[PDB]
Amino acid sequence: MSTDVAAAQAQSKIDLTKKKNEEINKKSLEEDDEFEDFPIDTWANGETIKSNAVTQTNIWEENWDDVEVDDDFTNELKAELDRYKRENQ
Amino acid sequence: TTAAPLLALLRENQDSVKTYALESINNVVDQLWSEISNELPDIEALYDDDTFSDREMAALIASKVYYNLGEYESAVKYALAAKDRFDIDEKSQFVETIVSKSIEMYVQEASKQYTKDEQFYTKDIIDPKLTS
Amino acid sequence: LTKSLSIAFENGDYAACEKLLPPIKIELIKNNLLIPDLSIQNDIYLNDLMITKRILEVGALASIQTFNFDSFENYFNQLKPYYFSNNHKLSESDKKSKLISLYLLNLLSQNNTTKFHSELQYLDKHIKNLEDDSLLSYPIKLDRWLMEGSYQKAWDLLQSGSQNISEFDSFTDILKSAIRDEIAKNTELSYDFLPLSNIKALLFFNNEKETEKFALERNWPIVNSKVYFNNQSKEKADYEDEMMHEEDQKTNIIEKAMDYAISIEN
Amino acid sequence: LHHSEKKYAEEDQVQELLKVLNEISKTTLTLDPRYIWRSLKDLSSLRNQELLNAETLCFTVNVLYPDSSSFKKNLLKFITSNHKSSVPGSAELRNSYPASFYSVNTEKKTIEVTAEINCFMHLLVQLFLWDSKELEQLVEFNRKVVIPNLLCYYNLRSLNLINAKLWFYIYLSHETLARSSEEINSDNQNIILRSTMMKFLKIASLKHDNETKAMLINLILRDFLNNGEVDSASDFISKLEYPHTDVSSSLEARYFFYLSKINAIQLDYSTANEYIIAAIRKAPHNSKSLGFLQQSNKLHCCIQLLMGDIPELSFFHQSNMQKSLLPYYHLTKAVKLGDLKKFTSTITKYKQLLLKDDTYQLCVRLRSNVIKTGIRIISLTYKKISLRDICLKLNLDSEQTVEYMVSRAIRDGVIEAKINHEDGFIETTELLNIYDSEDPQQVFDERIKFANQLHDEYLVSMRYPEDKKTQQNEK
Structure with missing residues (x-):
């Protein structure tokens, strides 16, 4: 979410009457939340959600199995292929 | 606007063009002080030369740049090395900081020179300019 | 008088x-007084701006062509704000596109890469697609190959860069040397010796006698046709130990322990 | 009808006036009026916006005016004049009232009380325009007046705090106008906007107010950043005058953001790491701050990829920032896996989106970082591997081409290997076990120095609120 534990820094900073004006000044420097352009350009985004469920949309601990495919199906072919060559060598 | 031409005119070789450089730098220095802070030795070089009578105009610029820099003590020395066009800034209340720094310096010096003799301002013990 | 510089460039x-x-x-100062240096622009100032600009541009190319690189640097600085300030109705030239290409090569040849990236950030909005990269490709693509580390592709763009002459050869020939020194540094770390033949290919020469003479002057001995990169590195390192600033930069053991106690005890 | 409405806005404002006014005519109490003023702006936005737009003109008639009523008339005139129940006897609440400057005393003779009331009124005009979302003619007119206004008199400690916010609104409205449309005028005002702020910084050093100085440095730094002047920003931060004395944590966040971004393109990434890590934690963490925070998160990962280190994929997943963090996930993935094809496709596909956040120029430099990650993997996995195999694995052109890569990269220590040119392989030199070297000493000391920094920081600040609070009376 943000650089560090993001949980530790959300609770350190909350709204006070002094702070509310500063949030508006920060927002207005760039002019809006900068969070509307992406909905507009794509017109209903399409993210990486197909590969697996540890992907961009994820609400659980990552498995780190989105940078690599399942190699077990390959291993099925490799194990058989070895036995054949092995046999007549 | 930009300091790039004003830096380049000091480096451009012709005596008239170097004098023209000073003229531009001195007029606009509250937006361009940062760039010409680095190229200060060129401003001191033209002041050293006796082939100019705007050697003073260069000394005046040096004080101005030091005032924006934050080095108020060294500005005084180059303010008094221009010698004229400093009355223009003695009646300026937005830069009377350098005018006041000369008096702050005088007080520290004077505590020393009173133990040499009670008179040091009717004698040459200190700069004549600081007394005046 | 003022017009003679303009027709002198055409001579060649x-x-x-x-x-x-x-x-x-001296007559250029009088031109600079006519424009306010563009703190307001009008249509009376528009015809004068062409006059002020024209004298800078033809001097800029003429100085590079006599190999006065210092003079060129000053001309570019003066010229830049004039393109910079205003809505376009005279803020470009046929010469401008060529001019920026030459300044970018000058920074690469002196190997001030820090200012090469800062300058192109500022340039980016004048050449994005308005003067689009059409001759500027030459320093930019070369920079791509040098960031990647492909000295190969970088060498080829120089080789094929002599077919097209605008005036770029005055910096192409410097850049050929810059490449050798950079490769010369990197190869010290890699290993301690290359045969003579393998040096000539990597450091880009056309004579084997050039290769060997370059080595001697750089303080590598070629003894039994093996270079000893490690000589110069020893020599530089010795020099550093020979000057003395040195005890505290490395920080003795005693010094560290002294520091701890006195921080506490204030 | 309208009369009732105008009286209620005026009433609500008299309360807010009293709070700050009573303190600053006792003697300046710089810090306390500052905090109240932050609260004041919020309430006034709701007041001004609702219950017709003629309340500001009425509020002027209530307080003293040498020319302040005349100036406020002109601004309302432009938006279709208003003078009804805006004239003494139907916008007058004073009639022998001392908090609004007893009427007898104002007729009688000289000494001014215009100062604090004028400055406060300017702040209300700026908010008034921004709510409307009209800038064009009214902004130019108000801008002309208020700058010579501040410099006609010589400001007090309290009066600095009011223009520390006034500049923010004149600065920002200009930036919108310049970005809306280009003219010969768009370039002309840019020159003026710089000149005034920079000179006012000089005055503000001598007046001893930090709040004005901190605001101006942010606004001046943003300006160099917008126009691509990396040269101008380098000089300004090297001729430091920035205060850490009296600021908001808002101002630290803006300052650290400009720093990190400016350092990136001139090929320093280590210090920019410090600045952007710092800036995110200092900023307030809220849903109305999402604009500024979103921009910080995007840059921070981009700068981690410039180093050659990799920011978590866990980062992009658990965020509620996913929609805007859609391009950065692919950019990280392209570098992480070290495939160059993927990276080329990605930065063309997200060209629009990155250009707005203008990381796009950094994206060009990250293609150097791709190949670094790609040969880093091969060296770690195979200790001794001929260049021949690397060509096969990463589709490099020849033995020479990858040779050059490694040769340049180990001068930097990225790969941390040595080449065997005679045998034709790269032999990795990382082995580990520096618990036989003297290395732990320097490492430990840098950690002790962080610990010692925390020891100083707490000691100073701990007693300071305690001493003011024991000063102040209590049971």
Whole structure:
């Protein structure tokens, strides 16, 4: 979410009457939340959600199995292929 | 606007063009002080030369740049090395900081020179300019 | 008088430019007074701006053509704000596109890469697609190959860069040397010796006798046709130990322990 | 009808006036009026916006005016004049009232009380325009007046705090106008906007107010950043005058953001790491701050990829920032896996989106970082591997081409290997076990120095609120 534990820094900073004006000044420097352009350009985004469920949309601990495919199906072919060559060598 | 031409005119070789450089730098220095802070030795070089009578105009610029820099003590020395066009800034209340720094310096010096003799301002013990 | 510089560039006599400039330099101040240096722009100032700009541009190319790189640096600085300030109705030239290509090569040849990236950030909005990269490709693509580390592709763009002459050869020939020194540094770390033949290919020469003479002057001995990169590195390192600033930069053991106790005890 | 409405806005404002006014005519109490003023702006936005737009003109008639009523008339005139129940006897609440400057005393003779009331009124005009979302003619007119206004008199400690916010609104409205449309005028005002702020910084050093100085440095730094002047920003931060004395944590966040971004393109990434890590934690963490925070998160990962280190894929997943963090996930993935094809496709596909956040120029430099990650993997996995195999694995052109890569990269220590040119392989030199070297000493000391920094920081600040609070009376 943000650089560090993001949980530790959300609770350190909350709204006070002094702070509310500063949030508006920060927002207005760039002019809006900068969070509307992406909905507009794509017109209903399409993210990486197909590969697996540890992907961009994820609400659980990552498995780190989105940078690599399942190699077990390959291993099925490799194990058989070895036995054949092995046999007549 | 930009300091790039004003830096380049000091480096451009012709005596008239170097004098023209000073003229531009001195007029606009509250937006361009940062760039010409680095190229200060060129401003001191033209002041050293006796082939100019705007050697003073260069000394005046040096004080101005030091005032924006934050080095108020060294500005005084180059303010008094221009010698004229400093009355223009003695009646300026937005830069009377350098005018006041000369008096702050005088007080520290004077505590020393009173133990040499009670008179040091009717004698040459200190700069004549600081007394005046 | 002022118009003679403009027609002198057309001759092709570019040293005749420099010897004619000094009077034009004093007459250029008078041109600068006509424009306010664009703190307001009007249509009376528009015809004057072409006059002020024209004298800078022809001097800029003439100085590079006599190999006065210092003079060129000053001309570019003066010229830049004039393109910079205003809505376009005279803020470009046929010469501008060529001009920026030459300044970018000058920073690469002196190997001030820090200012090469800062300058192109500022340039980016004048050449994005408005003067689009059409000759500027030459320093930019070269920079791509040098960031990647492909000295190979970088060498080829220089080789094929002599077919097209605008005036770029005055910096192409410097850049050929810059590449050798950079490769010369990197190869010290890699290993301690290359045969002579393997040096000539990597450091880009056309004579084996050039290869060996370059080594001697750089303080590598070629003894039994093996270079000893490690000589110069020892020699540089010795020099550093020979000057003395040195005890505290490395920080003795005693010094560290002294520091701890006195921080506490204040 | 309208009369009732105008009286209620005026009433609500008299309360807010009293709070700050009573303190600053006792003697300046710089810090306390500052905090109240932050609260004041919020309430006034709701007041001004609702219950017709003629309340500001009425509020002027209530307080003293040498020319302040005349100036406020002109601004309302432009938006279709208003003078009804805006004239003494139907916008007058004073009639022998001393908090609004007893009427007898104002007729009688000289000494001014215009100062604090004028400055406060300017702040209300700026908010008034921004709510409307009209800038064009009214902004130019108000801008002309208020700058010579501040410099006609010589400001007090309290009066600095009011223009520390006034500049923010004149600065920002200009930036919108310049970005809306280009003219010969768009370039002309840019020159003026710089000149005034920079000179006012000089005055503000001598007046001893930090709040004005901190605001101006942010605004001046943003300006160099917008126009691509990396040269101008380098000089300004090297001729430091920035305060850490009296600021908001808002101002630290803006300052650290400009720093990190400016350092990136001139090929320093280590210090920019410090600045952007710092800036995110200092900023307030809220849903109305999402604009500024979103921009910080995007840059921070981009700068981690410039180093050659990799920011978590866990980062992009658990965020509620996913929609805007859609391009950065692919950019990280392209570098992480070290495939160059993927990276080329990605930065063309997200060209629009990155250009707005203008990381796009950094994206060009990250293609150097791709190949670094790609050969880093091969060296770690195979200790001794001929260049021949690397060509096969990463589709490099020849033995020479990858040779050059490694040769340049180990001068930097990225790969941390040595080449065997005679045998034709790269032999990795990382082995580990520096618990036989003297290395732990320097490492430990840098950690002790962080610990010692925390020891100083707490000691100073701990007693300071305690001493003011024991000063102040209590049971």
